[PDB]
Design a protein around this motif. Structure first.
Motif: not given
Length: 120
Positions: A41, A45, A100-102
């Motif tokens: 995932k 990201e 921890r997101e793009k």
């Protein structure tokens, strides 16, 4: 020595980890595993966030290291749970704390490089 990847993320190894990071004013390392699901995932990201920063200014390049093959490096950063991101300044590791997101990752790395008027 190692040059042949068409992307934004850089692959740092125990052989060129302290030789590349040290030559990077501000770089971020993300320890991932080719078997760790959660990572599947982050992969997108992380690779994506690299595109936003690479285009930003100052451009903050990112790097992805495999704690599976570069265990030596992982242990050095007490990496016992991926994904595991960490900031590096001219050879200075710093526990990466944030989204921890793009988008997040990018926004963070920015404030790190110097959101405002900093010294040193």
């Amino acid at each position: 020595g190692s040059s042949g990847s068409s992307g934004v993320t850089l692959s740092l190894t125990k052989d060129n980890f302290d030789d590349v990071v040290n030559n990077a004013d501000i770089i971020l390392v993300e320890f991932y595993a080719p078997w760790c699901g959660h990572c599947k995932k982050l992969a997108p990201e992380y690779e994506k966030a690299a595109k936003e920063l690479s285009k930003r200014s100052p451009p903050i390049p990112l790097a992805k290291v495999d704690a599976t093959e570069q265990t030596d490096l992982a242990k050095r950063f007490d990496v016992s749970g991926y994904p595991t991101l960490k900031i590096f300044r001219k050879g200075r590791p710093f526990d990466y704390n944030g989204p921890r997101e793009k988008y997040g990752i990018v926004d963070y790395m920015i404030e790190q490089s110097g959101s405002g008027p900093s010294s040193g």
